[PDB]
Amino acid sequence: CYLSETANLGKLICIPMALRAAMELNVFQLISKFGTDAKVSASEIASKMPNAKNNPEAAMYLDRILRLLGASSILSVSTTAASINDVVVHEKLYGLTNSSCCLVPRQEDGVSLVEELLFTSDKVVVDSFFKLKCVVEEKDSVPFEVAHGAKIFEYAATEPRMNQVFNDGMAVFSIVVFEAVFRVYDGFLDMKELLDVGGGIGTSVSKIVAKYPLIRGVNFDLPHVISVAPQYPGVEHVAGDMFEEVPKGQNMLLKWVLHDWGDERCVKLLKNCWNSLPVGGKVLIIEFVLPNELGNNAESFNALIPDLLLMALNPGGKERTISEYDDLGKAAGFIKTIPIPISNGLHVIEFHK
């Protein structure tokens, strides 16, 4: 069946690259602006692209991208009786699906999955993936380091474009995740202070303080992140190195931090958190938890995606099961681990001092 499998295997590189181009051309948002149940042609979409206005062929090229996304069910495809009724209509109409509506920046605040997906398909990430085999062949190799000559957070301090793509990918994705957290988890209600350890540009703690305005928010990250962090209401920024010293705080958050590192580094960081917490404080771990048994579901893929990314991007980074997270907390001196399922594998895991 070689000439069946050419289609099944050959489409795999094509689909994400077509998707990235469509995101960069703001196709999904343009479709959305035609309204509910809109179905629009490539030429209608191209008409809304100022950069295409002196390119007669723009629509025909755009249609070649969109028809692949239609065949792969990212866009819906249809026509009309007027179109059907010696003339050949090349142009089908495209509409959003449940997947592509997650690519439309929200009217209120511009949030979507666009920024995280533009990070995970960025050239810096794909270049790392081109070196993925090195992790199997070579003891202690990291694909990102083979590709770029430096580790990712070191590299970010030298490369402002990559810094921005990464920081924004994490920040906007964090908004979506905290909306889900706030619907299920009530553990912030009693807090008076929250320190976000490796908090990025501060978006996560900015949203926590907005929802819970008695919380004094502190954001802690590396110098090159804090330098570009916005001023957020109710947030104080702190620059440093979490492996050397964590600021004192009543409660701490580690979101998407532990999965970046191996066990010894995770225990070192957790012990630094323990030392900086009071008796009765807690640290919250927010991660996509690896299910105990993998299957064909969102929970499994939500862990496998960052598992493969972190294998390429940082030494020791991996996704972990509940048991493996409990073992890290216990080794660092925490007690009473409380795993709280949120959505499709995302958990809050509380570690108590």
Catalog residues that contact ligand H68 under the rule CB under 6 A.
6-7, 10, 116, 120, 152, 170, 256, 260, 288, 302, 305-306, 309-310, 313-314
Please report how close the Cβ of residue 286 comes to ligand H68 at its closest, in angstroms.
9
- C-beta closer to ligand H68: residue 6 or 275: 6
Question: Which of these is catalytic: 148, 224, 259, 347?
Answer: 259
| Stretch of residues binding ligand SAH (CB under 6 A), selected from 56-64, 71-79, 143-151, 251-259 | 251-259
Identity of residue 19: L
Active site (annotated) includes residue 347 = no
Which one of ligand H68, ligand SAH, a copy of itself, none interacts with residue 13, CB within 5 to 8 A by kind?
a copy of itself
Q: Please, are residues 211 and 182 in contact by the beta-carbon 8 Å criterion?
A: yes
- C-beta closer to ligand SAH: residue 93 or 257: 257
Query: Within 13 A of 309's CA, how many CA atoms are on the CB side?
Result: 20
DSSP characters over 257-300: SGGGS-HHHHHHHHHHHHHHSPTT-EEEEEEEPPPSS--SSHHH
User: Residue 116: which residues within 8 A CB-CB, separation 6 or more?
Assistant: 169, 170, 172, 173
3-state secondary structure of 147: helix
The two tokens of residue 89 are 């209509």
Q: Is 198 annotated as a binding residue?
A: yes
- C-beta closer to ligand SAH: residue 129 or 155: 155
Q: Is 255 annotated as a binding residue?
A: yes
In the set 70, 95, 198, 317, which binds ligand SAH (CB under 6 A)?
198
User: Residue 139: which residues within 8 A CB-CB, separation 6 or more?
Assistant: none
Q: Does 222 bind a copy of itself (CB under 8 A)?
A: no
Q: Residue 163: left (phi > 0), alpha (psi -120 to 50), or beta?
A: alpha
Q: Interface residues with ligand SAH (CB under 6 A)? A: 153, 170, 174, 198-200, 204, 221-222, 225, 241-243, 255-257, 260
Active-site positions?
Answer: 259
